[model samples]
Target: HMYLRITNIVESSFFTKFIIYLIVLNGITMGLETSKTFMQSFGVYTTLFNQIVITIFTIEIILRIYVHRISFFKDPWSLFDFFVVAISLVPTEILRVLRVLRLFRLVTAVPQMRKIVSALISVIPGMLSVIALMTLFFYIFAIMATQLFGERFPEWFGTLGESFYTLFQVMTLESWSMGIVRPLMEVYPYAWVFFIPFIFVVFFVMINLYVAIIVDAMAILNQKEEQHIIDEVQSHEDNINNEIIKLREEIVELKELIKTSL
Candidate 1:
């Protein structure tokens, strides 16, 4: 019962806000720890604050587990929370490098962040197809570049790996023209004929397709979330209606008994 009460409190908006505030404060302290001047002045207090935050997180996880029992682990969010807290408990120098991981709590603290992350995860399967297509283009162009320019531009496209690297630069549009392409154009004049189409198809079109897939996934997730809320409201209304019907039946039975007695 105590654990249940703790669960309710933890689930309350005020408590969630409090935890979020603590996380923000913890993040500030973590950032401050990185500065040598701040550490020299308030290092001890920062360390104490970090420990206190970790303790609170640990207790939060324990209370959640006690309330939900084994079912707590069934929820991915809970597991994420558990691991975030658990990582801080490990005593190792490697943890110093992992302090950035504590910032991951912001993902749980912010609902929008959680939804975005979930939406991104939901689109992974679709993204794999896009990635496969991109990879196929990379392979084709890499081979083409190697065969076409290997003799002239040995440094840029002599080998398959070199061609792939050069094409990657082209895809990024990072000085592909001035740094690599324009110079090649002077020598070959038709270099743009190959690189331009590759950039258009791979960088512009394929990248847009990837973005469109993620947008569509987010839209679908939003629809499903709305439907879930609607179902919950409907279920609540049905329960209220059933209670009213049962109460009416009980009142009718009582009135008939009173009439019989009279």
Candidate 2:
């Protein structure tokens, strides 16, 4: 009964269904809004319809917040709903362009999105800790490089901070050879004493660290999917048990009727 009540609120409410339809319309309008000028002009009706759809979206946001009040933030879907509505209020083209990110809000209609969110939440702590540890080690390597190569290579590792900056660039494999390593080599021929080892520890080790985090997140996603399937199975079993109980009651009544006839 409790779950049924929740489902009624979530899936059966007219207002909820109306909101979903509005979101669908909003997605469709967005697709049209980005169309090329020639393609968009093919139908005057579509142009008028787009305006009406946007106006409806603006009103829908106001109504949702008016209805939910502070409780609007209690669920993830509510934040997305509020954002989609609020972002539409931007007056400038630059701000309006940011609205493209709101397309991800469409994922709320899908069950798998919630599962993905759950998986991310479940792994947040461990993943963050690993990132912090890598950063700490990176800084340690940077400081050592600065102490060893900074004065000798004034152009590159001029200060401990510059050394860290160069290390950061190298770790990401960005355009660092010109901006970072070359400067170090320019001042000191023997700078490779510090540079070679720094590259190995920071760049080599960090690539593997990045991969490990991705692998861990994927593993979490898989686990979440398995849990979802198990939940569906349990729900099916409950429904079957309820049906069996109803059939047994009907059979008992039939036996009583036959006995009375005899």
Candidate 3:
């Protein structure tokens, strides 16, 4: 009965709200931990408050282990909380730094995010081909730029690595004109032959990568919603047509009953 009651509380959104605010407060104190001046005055409360945060999580962990241990493993999110709670308690500097990831644990507090997050996660496997293709293009162009632009523009294309970074910058299309390509063209007179083609190809691949993500997301959104929308539309049309037919029959009966038509 106690296990059932304990889990009943955990299964609710109220507990989720508490933990979200708990994370926010913990983050604030952790931020305070960064300031030596504040710590010099109220460092004890900072540590003390953090341990207080621990007690809340620790109790939840115990209840989870004691009551929902079987189900906890089956739910990856709770299992992750199990891991985060244990590691958050570890009193070390280097490893404790992983607590930064705890900030993102806010995702667990809301169920709605898991859908889009799940959609994007599902999209990654399909994304790998475009990523690999883009990498190959970058590598091939990086080498070519290094050889062609190396002597003339040593700063941007001096080494293969420099060329790779410049190519990435250009792919972003931030200031590839007067800032980069135009200046290079002034020197080489035909450098656009290299940069222009690279720009188009890189963006073509980037847009294709984005298209895959959007298509998957659209599919996710439309799955259940499309059917529900269709059903609602069909039901409304049926109601309107039935009412119209009733009105028409009523008018015909009224005309027939009125004093015998000629």
Instruction: Compose the digit string of candidate 3's lDDT tens values, residues 1-262.
Output: 7778877787777876888898889888888889989999999988888888878988877876787768778887777777787788887676678866666566756677667677668867887887898899999999999999888899999999999999999988878897889989878889999989998887777787788678877998897799899999999999999999899988888878874855
TM-score of each: 0.62, 0.52, 0.62
Candidate 3 TM-score to native:
0.62
Ranking by lDDT: 1, 3, 2
Once fitted onto the true fold, the runs of candidate 1 whose alpha carbons sit more than 4 angstroms away are 1-5, 92-95, 116-124, 139-166, 182-194, 207-262
Model 2, 96-186: lDDT tens digits are: 7766655565566556776787776875676677678878887788788778777777555678788777777776767656766677677
For each candidate, the alpha-carbon lDDT, in order, equals 0.86, 0.69, 0.83
lDDT of 2 at 262: 94
Global CA lDDT computed for model 2:
0.69
> Candidate 2: which stretches are off by over 4 Å?
1-25, 28-55, 62-69, 135-168, 175-184, 190-199, 203-262
Model 3 CA RMSD to the hidden true structure, in angstroms: 6.8
Angstrom error of the Cα, residue 49, model 2: value is 5.6
Candidate 3 ranges beyond 4 A from true positions: 1-9, 12-17, 31-40, 58-76, 79-98, 120-122, 150-155, 158-161, 208-262
